[model samples]
Target: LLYPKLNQLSNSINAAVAFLLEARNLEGWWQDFNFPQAASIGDEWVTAYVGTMLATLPYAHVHEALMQAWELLKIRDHRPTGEWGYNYILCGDAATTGWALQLAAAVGASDSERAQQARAALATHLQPNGGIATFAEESIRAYIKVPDLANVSFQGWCGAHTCVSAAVAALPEFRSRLHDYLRVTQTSQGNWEGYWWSDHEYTTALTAEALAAGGQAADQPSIEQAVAWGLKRLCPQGFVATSKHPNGSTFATAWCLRLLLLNTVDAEVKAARAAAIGWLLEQQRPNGSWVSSAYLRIPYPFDRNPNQFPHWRYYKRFEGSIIFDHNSIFTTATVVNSLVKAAPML
Candidate 1:
């Protein structure tokens, strides 16, 4: 079992090295982290995550590229508004912030240095309320007049619903206060619903990731439950990219796999990882792009279509047409990074 995973790691690293080589410049600076879509220039946290993973891999001979990427990280500071943004448009919130900070640190971005500014920017949004809000605007939108119940209030700041609770685990300092929220919000199988207002796959994978980040390793009971929750949704082909269906996306699967791999030392995580990898390897395309089973509107967890009814679309319309016109560099980068990162750990 370990041998096969090692082989997968080899293939994954090969692809990752090639991918990173193209992403770097002579000075080791990065052009953005988006792939399959290259939305912008300048390496950001999202891309940094991929770059760091590649550069740090055991024997991937890409020191030059990694150094350049690190230099770029040193030159600029990301204002973590709050989290990791699906779009690299600098819209910091929670998920992406956590992703960026973790990635930066992984590549040596110090909490008191390169990542400091970003962390400072994230302070205002940490809510004294306990769980981190999906967006920084939660106070203005959800808790308006009820200031007392805003940040650390036991009530749901966004909605009285389940959130995979991703951003909540970004730092250990906040863990003690938010632990109970984590416990209650988790699903029966132990996975919390994700934050995306539109994409269930995004939320599912992210939620799992978030749970794992909060110390829910395979050795823990929660990890076992999550593996079970995630497994029941897997297709016969061995992919769980789609929510309640067989359709899969490299974008979603990568995030899911990333979360699972971080702590998969047990049977459940091992099995799920194997099944997911099989499905993903089979789906890789000739041009190197792994096509998703469908076109996702956005990471919003709701409808991005302007035509959908505001209320019904967000909470009701979970799935719909796959507008062939859409593609995301972020999604592509995320897929590559997550898969490459997980190839070994799993």
Candidate 2:
């Protein structure tokens, strides 16, 4: 029903589009007002995210918003290192660093020295397994002004690892290894876990994008396994969830839609995408926003017991504050991105 009614669906999309437009600062950037004091400063990450979405989605303000945000982000990069991070840790970050470069490239800043340096800096994160390392503690202490993760082992975060891998997959050296790592790390159930999110949907979306970037065909074994895994998670109500406990939320469903669209061209993928889009449209509020829990990066303390089991637990520490953005910003953006993905061909 939604697919056949382009004119009607566009109206719903435009409502959220209007909300995003109103949310930006006069500086032409966006930020989650709910974030901790440290990460509350810059608009680099949010602007890049919103700008990328705007560029892809057809809208009257697309050019103006994208150009304005691009100019702001250029000045937002941490100098010398040319990477972006939340508060005090400025030398650069494995997470936001690649995102900044992506935003720059998206807006035609690919030739700029700032963009090139950012790209060069990211090359240092390439792991043999094709995953990118999160920021090192040493670098964070030296570069970050506010020192959020300074005392903790921030590296090896599986979420950041997948994100950075996806961002850098276009580079030949990183592509193969990234794919190798992606393939191996996927659980037998077809999902890859994330240190940041509460569900596999988020990690799955990011991982699927990485796989696509690495040139894995839709029919490839790993890809097929993942899509099958995701499809099974879809609820009768047309939403997806990490587990059965509380039903699904907009954030989870948006990512599920994103991965399904990116990972395959099969008819089932299309039908699922269409159904998911319809469900998302139905979830939009009168204010043009969607309510979903924020994904966080707070670390939990590990048991010191000698027989604690998994070796990964040893690396856990309660060092940094959990970053959150429950404000409508993230969910709204994610939903808009999904809708843009499904927008009818011109």
**Best lDDT among the predictions, by candidate number:** 2
Q: What tens digits encode model 1's per-residue C-alpha lDDT throughout 1-346? A: 5687668556754664555455445655444322233234424544554554454455545654555555555545343333344344445555445555655655565555546665665555555545565455543244233344334432332332224244435455444455556666666655555433333444445545555566644425665566566666555566664442447656657656765664555676767777777777666654444553323222222322222424322112222323221233344455666666666655
**Count: clashes, candidate 1:** 25
The prediction achieving the highest TM-score against the true structure is 2
lDDT of model 2, residue 321: 35
lDDT, candidates in the order shown:
0.50, 0.64
Per-residue lDDT of candidate 2, residues 6-65 (tens digit): 764687788888888888777657876343344344466666666765667655577777
Candidate 1 RMSD to the real structure: 7.5
Span of ten consecutive residues with least summed lDDT in model 1: 312-321
Q: Tell me the spans in candidate 2 whose CA falls farther than 4 Å from its real position.
A: 1-4, 33-42, 87-91, 141-160, 170-177, 216-219, 242-245, 263-265, 300-323
Off-target runs (Cα >4 Å) in candidate 1 are: 1-9, 23-45, 52-56, 59-67, 73-92, 138-168, 173-177, 197-219, 241-245, 262-269, 292-329, 336-346
As a TM-score, model 1 comes out at: 0.65
